[PDB]
Design an enzyme around this catalytic site. Sequence first.
Site, PDB file in Angstrom:
ATOM      1  N   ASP A  63      62.910  56.821  58.134  1.00 50.61           N
ATOM      2  CA  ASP A  63      62.676  58.072  57.462  1.00 50.61           C
ATOM      3  C   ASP A  63      63.907  58.227  56.553  1.00 50.61           C
ATOM      4  OD1 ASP A  63      62.842  60.612  56.580  1.00 50.61           O
ATOM      5  OD2 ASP A  63      62.567  61.563  58.552  1.00 50.61           O
ATOM      6  N   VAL A  64      63.706  58.045  55.263  1.00 47.57           N
ATOM      7  CA  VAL A  64      64.806  58.056  54.302  1.00 47.57           C
ATOM      8  C   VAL A  64      65.471  59.386  54.089  1.00 47.57           C
ATOM      9  CG1 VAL A  64      63.841  56.057  53.290  1.00 47.57           C
ATOM     10  CG2 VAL A  64      63.182  58.391  52.493  1.00 47.57           C
ATOM     11  N   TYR A 155      52.001  68.285  37.745  1.00 46.66           N
ATOM     12  CA  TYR A 155      52.921  67.285  38.260  1.00 46.66           C
ATOM     13  C   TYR A 155      54.244  67.901  38.505  1.00 46.66           C
ATOM     14  CZ  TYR A 155      54.573  62.644  39.577  1.00 46.66           C
ATOM     15  OH  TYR A 155      55.096  61.600  40.282  1.00 46.66           O
ATOM     16  N   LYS A 162      61.002  61.943  39.309  1.00 41.03           N
ATOM     17  CA  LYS A 162      60.691  60.603  38.816  1.00 41.03           C
ATOM     18  C   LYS A 162      61.626  60.194  37.705  1.00 41.03           C
ATOM     19  CE  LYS A 162      57.092  59.520  41.349  1.00 41.03           C
ATOM     20  NZ  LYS A 162      57.125  58.250  42.189  1.00 41.03           N
TER      21      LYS A 162
HETATM   22  C1  LIG Z   1      52.980  66.459  47.526  1.00 40.39           C
HETATM   23  C2  LIG Z   1      53.152  64.991  47.030  1.00 40.39           C
HETATM   24  C3  LIG Z   1      53.408  64.043  47.969  1.00 40.39           C
HETATM   25  C4  LIG Z   1      53.882  62.792  47.590  1.00 40.39           C
HETATM   26  C5  LIG Z   1      54.100  62.441  46.287  1.00 40.39           C
HETATM   27  S1  LIG Z   1      54.353  60.852  45.848  1.00 40.39           S
HETATM   28  O1  LIG Z   1      54.467  60.082  47.036  1.00 40.39           O
HETATM   29  O2  LIG Z   1      55.660  60.843  45.218  1.00 40.39           O
HETATM   30  N1  LIG Z   1      53.254  60.097  44.819  1.00 40.39           N
HETATM   31  N2  LIG Z   1      52.065  60.160  45.372  1.00 40.39           N
HETATM   32  C6  LIG Z   1      50.963  60.040  44.677  1.00 40.39           C
HETATM   33  C7  LIG Z   1      50.940  59.864  43.307  1.00 40.39           C
HETATM   34  C8  LIG Z   1      52.148  59.793  42.646  1.00 40.39           C
HETATM   35  C9  LIG Z   1      52.102  59.708  41.272  1.00 40.39           C
HETATM   36  C10 LIG Z   1      50.883  59.688  40.567  1.00 40.39           C
HETATM   37  C11 LIG Z   1      49.669  59.700  41.265  1.00 40.39           C
HETATM   38  C12 LIG Z   1      49.714  59.807  42.635  1.00 40.39           C
HETATM   39  B1  LIG Z   1      53.484  59.922  43.405  1.00 40.39           B
HETATM   40  O3  LIG Z   1      54.227  61.040  42.562  1.00 40.39           O
HETATM   41  O4  LIG Z   1      54.299  58.629  43.263  1.00 40.39           O
HETATM   42  C13 LIG Z   1      53.710  57.683  44.036  1.00 40.39           C
HETATM   43  C14 LIG Z   1      54.610  57.186  45.205  1.00 40.39           C
HETATM   44  O5  LIG Z   1      55.887  57.114  44.873  1.00 40.39           O
HETATM   45  C15 LIG Z   1      54.204  55.675  45.535  1.00 40.39           C
HETATM   46  C16 LIG Z   1      53.208  55.453  46.549  1.00 40.39           C
HETATM   47  O6  LIG Z   1      52.010  56.213  46.277  1.00 40.39           O
HETATM   48  P1  LIG Z   1      50.714  55.974  47.134  1.00 40.39           P
HETATM   49  O7  LIG Z   1      50.733  54.512  47.534  1.00 40.39           O
HETATM   50  O8  LIG Z   1      49.576  56.637  46.522  1.00 40.39           O
HETATM   51  O9  LIG Z   1      51.237  56.902  48.382  1.00 40.39           O
HETATM   52  P2  LIG Z   1      50.966  57.102  49.904  1.00 40.39           P
HETATM   53  O10 LIG Z   1      49.888  56.131  50.378  1.00 40.39           O
HETATM   54  O11 LIG Z   1      50.875  58.597  50.241  1.00 40.39           O
HETATM   55  O12 LIG Z   1      52.366  56.592  50.414  1.00 40.39           O
HETATM   56  C17 LIG Z   1      53.626  57.353  50.242  1.00 40.39           C
HETATM   57  C18 LIG Z   1      54.441  56.942  51.366  1.00 40.39           C
HETATM   58  O13 LIG Z   1      55.710  57.643  51.380  1.00 40.39           O
HETATM   59  C19 LIG Z   1      56.124  57.689  52.704  1.00 40.39           C
HETATM   60  N3  LIG Z   1      57.212  58.653  52.824  1.00 40.39           N
HETATM   61  C20 LIG Z   1      57.276  60.014  52.531  1.00 40.39           C
HETATM   62  N4  LIG Z   1      58.350  60.640  52.942  1.00 40.39           N
HETATM   63  C21 LIG Z   1      59.045  59.732  53.628  1.00 40.39           C
HETATM   64  C22 LIG Z   1      58.386  58.480  53.516  1.00 40.39           C
HETATM   65  N5  LIG Z   1      58.896  57.363  54.073  1.00 40.39           N
HETATM   66  C23 LIG Z   1      60.114  57.536  54.734  1.00 40.39           C
HETATM   67  N6  LIG Z   1      60.751  58.666  54.823  1.00 40.39           N
HETATM   68  C24 LIG Z   1      60.330  59.854  54.345  1.00 40.39           C
HETATM   69  N7  LIG Z   1      61.059  60.928  54.475  1.00 40.39           N
HETATM   70  C25 LIG Z   1      54.905  58.095  53.519  1.00 40.39           C
HETATM   71  O14 LIG Z   1      55.038  58.057  54.857  1.00 40.39           O
HETATM   72  C26 LIG Z   1      53.871  57.193  52.811  1.00 40.39           C
HETATM   73  O15 LIG Z   1      53.722  55.872  53.464  1.00 40.39           O
HETATM   74  O16 LIG Z   1      53.545  55.251  44.222  1.00 40.39           O
HETATM   75  C27 LIG Z   1      53.562  56.361  43.293  1.00 40.39           C
HETATM   76  N8  LIG Z   1      52.338  56.279  42.407  1.00 40.39           N
HETATM   77  C28 LIG Z   1      52.686  56.103  41.155  1.00 40.39           C
HETATM   78  C29 LIG Z   1      51.747  56.082  40.194  1.00 40.39           C
HETATM   79  C30 LIG Z   1      50.422  56.241  40.483  1.00 40.39           C
HETATM   80  C31 LIG Z   1      50.179  56.429  41.842  1.00 40.39           C
HETATM   81  C32 LIG Z   1      48.721  56.690  42.287  1.00 40.39           C
HETATM   82  N9  LIG Z   1      48.500  56.885  43.588  1.00 40.39           N
HETATM   83  O17 LIG Z   1      47.858  56.669  41.373  1.00 40.39           O
HETATM   84  C33 LIG Z   1      51.058  56.496  42.862  1.00 40.39           C
HETATM   85  C34 LIG Z   1      53.819  63.417  45.347  1.00 40.39           C
HETATM   86  C35 LIG Z   1      53.343  64.671  45.713  1.00 40.39           C
END
Ligand SMILES: [C]C1=[C][C]=C(S(=O)(=O)N2N=[C]C3=C([C]=[C][C]=[C]3)[B@]2([O])O[C]2[C]([O])[C]([C]OP(=O)([O-])OP([O])(=O)O[C][C]3O[C](N4[C]=NC5=C4N=[C]N=C5[N])[C]([O])[C]3[O])O[C]2[N+]2=[C][C]=[C]C(C([N])=O)=[C]2)[C]=[C]1
Lengths: 257, 257, 257, 257
Positions: A63-64, A155, A162
């Site tokens: 789990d980042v 968005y 992004k």
């Molecule tokens: C409210 C919401 C939620 C979320 C998001 S995101 O992810 O960022 N995304 N999604 C969807 C879409 C996009 C764009 C456009 C359209 C749609 B986004 O903004 O980006 C994306 C991403 O980066 C990649 C991949 O996707 P997919 O293959 O579809 O997806 P899924 O199946 O749901 O997968 C995801 C993943 O992640 C993970 N995580 C969360 N949190 C966490 C994690 N790991 C670790 N740690 C933590 N804390 C979960 O679990 C799952 O496995 O690629 C991209 N893209 C680009 C372009 C196009 C696309 C489409 N689909 O068409 C995609 C937002 C809002």
Amino acid sequence: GFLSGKRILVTGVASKLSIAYGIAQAMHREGAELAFTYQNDKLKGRVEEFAAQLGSDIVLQCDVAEDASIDTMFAELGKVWPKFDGFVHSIGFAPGDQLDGDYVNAVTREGFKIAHDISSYSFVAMAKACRSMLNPGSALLTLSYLGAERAIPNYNVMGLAKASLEANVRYMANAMGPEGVRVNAISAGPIRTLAASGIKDFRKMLAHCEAVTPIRRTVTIEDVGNSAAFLCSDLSAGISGEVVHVDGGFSIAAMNE
Amino acid sequence: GFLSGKRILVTGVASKLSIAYGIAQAMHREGAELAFTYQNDKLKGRVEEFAAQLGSDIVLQCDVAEDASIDTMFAELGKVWPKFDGFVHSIGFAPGDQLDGDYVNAVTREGFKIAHDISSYSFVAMAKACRSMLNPGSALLTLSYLGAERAIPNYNVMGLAKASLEANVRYMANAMGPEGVRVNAISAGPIRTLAASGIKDFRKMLAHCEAVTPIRRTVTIEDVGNSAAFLCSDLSAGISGEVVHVDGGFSIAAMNE
Amino acid sequence: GFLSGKRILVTGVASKLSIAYGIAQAMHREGAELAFTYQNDKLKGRVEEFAAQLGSDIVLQCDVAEDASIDTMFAELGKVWPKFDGFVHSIGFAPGDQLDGDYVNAVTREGFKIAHDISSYSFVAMAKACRSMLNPGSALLTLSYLGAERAIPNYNVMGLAKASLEANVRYMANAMGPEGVRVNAISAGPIRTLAASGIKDFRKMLAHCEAVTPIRRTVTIEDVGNSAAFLCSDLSAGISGEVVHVDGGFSIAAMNE
Amino acid sequence: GFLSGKRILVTGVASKLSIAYGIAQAMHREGAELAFTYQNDKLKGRVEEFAAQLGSDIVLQCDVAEDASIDTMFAELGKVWPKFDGFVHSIGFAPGDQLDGDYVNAVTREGFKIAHDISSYSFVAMAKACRSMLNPGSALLTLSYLGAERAIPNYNVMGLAKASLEANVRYMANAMGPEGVRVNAISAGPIRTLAASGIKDFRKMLAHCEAVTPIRRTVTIEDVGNSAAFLCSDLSAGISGEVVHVDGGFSIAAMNE
Ligand SMILES: [C]C1=[C][C]=C(S(=O)(=O)N2N=[C]C3=C([C]=[C][C]=[C]3)[B@]2([O])O[C]2[C]([O])[C]([C]OP(=O)([O-])OP([O])(=O)O[C][C]3O[C](N4[C]=NC5=C4N=[C]N=C5[N])[C]([O])[C]3[O])O[C]2[N+]2=[C][C]=[C]C(C([N])=O)=[C]2)[C]=[C]1
Ligand SMILES: [C]C1=[C][C]=C(S(=O)(=O)N2N=[C]C3=C([C]=[C][C]=[C]3)[B@]2([O])O[C]2[C]([O])[C]([C]OP(=O)([O-])OP([O])(=O)O[C][C]3O[C](N4[C]=NC5=C4N=[C]N=C5[N])[C]([O])[C]3[O])O[C]2[N+]2=[C][C]=[C]C(C([N])=O)=[C]2)[C]=[C]1
Ligand SMILES: [C]C1=[C][C]=C(S(=O)(=O)N2N=[C]C3=C([C]=[C][C]=[C]3)[B@]2([O])O[C]2[C]([O])[C]([C]OP(=O)([O-])OP([O])(=O)O[C][C]3O[C](N4[C]=NC5=C4N=[C]N=C5[N])[C]([O])[C]3[O])O[C]2[N+]2=[C][C]=[C]C(C([N])=O)=[C]2)[C]=[C]1
Ligand SMILES: [C]C1=[C][C]=C(S(=O)(=O)N2N=[C]C3=C([C]=[C][C]=[C]3)[B@]2([O])O[C]2[C]([O])[C]([C]OP(=O)([O-])OP([O])(=O)O[C][C]3O[C](N4[C]=NC5=C4N=[C]N=C5[N])[C]([O])[C]3[O])O[C]2[N+]2=[C][C]=[C]C(C([N])=O)=[C]2)[C]=[C]1
């Protein structure tokens, strides 16, 4: 295949519709040895099952959001892959309230924060943590969206995250190239799926896209996976710090109607 | 290989240092069937010799300055390849006086004209002429230079022609995608060679580039050939109208010193 | 006026609806001394009349197709303005056959030639002719269109010409910078007019724009005039080699519908 | 003055050398009514003094780190300006540890957080707070840096923050457009100053720039002020969602050495 001999770590597999599933399949077909991570106990079994189908049994939790989780995962990978050839970052997140309606009204300090922590910082976090175990010729990959370059309805803040991500690709490329590491991103089109999105009115997005895309169709996870495999192979040695648009030409056209 | 079954036509081979030689080798290694063209009687024998080395005996004359030459070549290819999967345009030209010193002082109406005719128009000329014989899934490729996006010393008018070329890629992609054709360009870095250039002070260009490029080296025709083969294969189905930078990240960095 | 003490030369006035007319009006309002050129006899009186309204009697012929025409115009202009401060280039021409339909089909060697010659080379052609007549602090301006950057139905080869023009802006910028000259371009959006445009289905281009343009309207020659004045004034001193978009945020949004 | 009849709010004045000071001076000169905010007690008097010189007595505290701070500042500002015409955002902050060395090593979760929060989110934060106080025709401005677009040694995570900020400009532009509000950013080049910058080896950045900048000098807060005034004035009516480079053509040239 052109990935034979390569040991890749793949993230963000959550289902058979996941972009990363498609990347995993493709990399496997080109002969790479894969490792997988999962976010939580809810996904653990699906991934373990996919892993096995692709001849792997290196499935680890990550789990980042937590540096410790990142460190611990890399610590465990090391027991089996002391060194490896890079990883595919296919992670992203933001609270739903965030992706609905007027951007200014929707955005909040916390949402912005979360979106950016998970969706952009996490990529370098991982690099920071496995830097020492990467082999020369290693390749790091992330996935982005036009959303980062243009203002796309609903968005909202993911667009910002992004843009941060894509800048990240460049700063990381610059920092790591000298030691043998290449870093790029694939900016993919909206993928036609059955599931349900976070992006509000995604269904329409898909519809419009197909009509006005030069190739006249949306891309597939196959399309995306094939590019990622190339971008992670030695065949792309001359490419780094790049954001490759895999969207069938959508971004380069205008007023096609 | 991933090009097996594909019948490609390759242009601009003039020597073993030619980018197109590198592309030809690579495409051949990935199992494509190749055809070659040559500009004039001065090059005919070298190309015929290279062709043979890559299992081909389809060597035809084509000087893209003359629509008739283009038509006639395509007419003859047809006898043996009634249909085919695209071509690699690796042609370029401008009078030498043009690439030396202050751009404004150097440029002339005629130079501009020539540079643009040969270096940009020629690509669509070829497409126009073989349009009917291309198969769905066919891919057209051209080679460009940063020169098109930034003002580069001495590069002068080629910079303009290249910008025209890159716009050409987009207009062609848009026009042909609906019938199955993809069109892209590779923007390659300056390649380290022994020969002598048209670009004045090229040697320096190479030197500086290696020092400040993220990968810390100039790219090779191998690097370039590998990307072209991918870009011409079905593996790139989701990519069209794109200008891929194969320059080891040079363009994305700044003030590295 | 922020243009007070400037002598600026204005190109391409052909009606009260021409973008150059609007640039002229603004510049004059901001205190600039103006001069005008016309393409051929048929426009002589018209331009002569506008000029009158703009408090000028400097009206010369100039057909950018001919080097001698340019040499002469400047030869004459210099009898009264031995030194001046910049010329506004609002010129472009393609043969109509070129602007309708499939680019690849429509395009032709000659069409391509003419389009670039007139729409692109011309700009440097003039620079080259009056280079020594320019004062430090001068500024050159040209007008582009989004078609340079994106594939737009029917715009076709004009798109390549503009791309070439925009590259010219940078090369020119980079060459004349050290001698005190700035060069920039304004990329205007489609301007709602009543006449008829050489550009196909333009009305629709108009309708669509207003709907999806962030400011929700089309720009006026007024809007364009104003940005023009600024960019040729000392107020824009830090700006050179720039393509300023003046299209109400249109190029930046995507899928607004 | 082309700013006559406008009430504009100016953020981030901290010295006579601050970019905001220069924007203020120009705006005032062009007829705008100004108001100022300061970050903390330590800057109160300074800003209070500048304001005096700029014929203002509207000086409020505002720390963009706190939503309540912003809410309150506007609550107070509205006692005197119930409606106004735009605010200039010249704010940004990273912890120093972040700006020196290998990005990947230097970077940290918190550092990243703070950088984006302060340097990016803040801009929308303020928009969000005064949205209803804005008159039709208002304009919001922020200041970026080339680091958003390119990898620059030591700029590190600030580069990601700016990229995020520039994306914000477009999203904001696209959301408030229909209600009469324009949002743009000026991407300034490095400004030669005497003090010391939180940014590492900046002096060299300066030296290098002048040498290779097309205009052959660094820009001044004066140059920046002027572009700023223009972009917040009705003269820039057709411009929204734009990142205007005000760095003397620096970003556009390559290999000038
Ligand atoms: C409210 C919401 C939620 C979320 C998001 S995101 O992810 O960022 N995304 N999604 C969807 C879409 C996009 C764009 C456009 C359209 C749609 B986004 O903004 O980006 C994306 C991403 O980066 C990649 C991949 O996707 P997919 O293959 O579809 O997806 P899924 O199946 O749901 O997968 C995801 C993943 O992640 C993970 N995580 C969360 N949190 C966490 C994690 N790991 C670790 N740690 C933590 N804390 C979960 O679990 C799952 O496995 O690629 C991209 N893209 C680009 C372009 C196009 C696309 C489409 N689909 O068409 C995609 C937002 C809002
Ligand atoms: C004066 C001059 C001349 C020429 C030119 S170009 O060609 O255009 N180029 N070159 C070189 C270079 C460049 C850039 C940069 C650097 C360098 B460019 O600009 O571009 C190029 C091209 O396009 C391609 C190719 O190259 P390479 O391979 O190197 O070459 P070569 O070997 O010489 O080859 C060529 C060819 O072509 C042909 N042609 C001509 N004309 C003609 C033709 N064909 C037909 N027809 C006619 N008319 C001949 O014959 C030969 O074969 O690629 C490019 N690149 C890019 C990038 C980089 C590079 C390097 N190298 O590094 C290249 C200019 C000036
Ligand atoms: C058919 C054709 C096509 C095209 C052309 S042009 O000129 O090029 N154009 N037009 C229109 C348009 C465009 C774009 C977009 C839209 C529209 B284009 O491409 O561009 C334009 C131009 O460049 C400028 C200006 O316009 P305007 O003002 O509109 O117009 P006019 O009035 O008609 O004016 C022009 C001029 O030129 C001249 N010239 C020619 N040729 C020549 C000349 N001069 C001298 N010499 C020679 N050779 C005449 O006379 C006149 O005055 O701008 C542009 N724009 C941009 C953007 C937007 C716009 C609008 N409109 O919207 C425009 C042609 C043909
Ligand atoms: C360490 C660190 C880093 C960074 C920062 S910042 O701000 O962000 N910056 N600085 C510098 C520079 C830059 C870039 C480039 C170069 C340089 B940056 O990144 O950016 C900038 C900014 O944004 C603006 C303005 O600046 P100036 O004016 O220069 O500065 P000053 O005077 O210091 O000002 C600032 C301000 O902010 C404020 N704040 C903070 N925090 C806060 C605030 N407020 C409220 N609240 C809170 N919380 C203070 O107080 C002050 O007033 O611009 C930009 N730029 C751009 C381009 C160029 C330039 C030059 N200089 O050249 C600039 C930080 C830290």
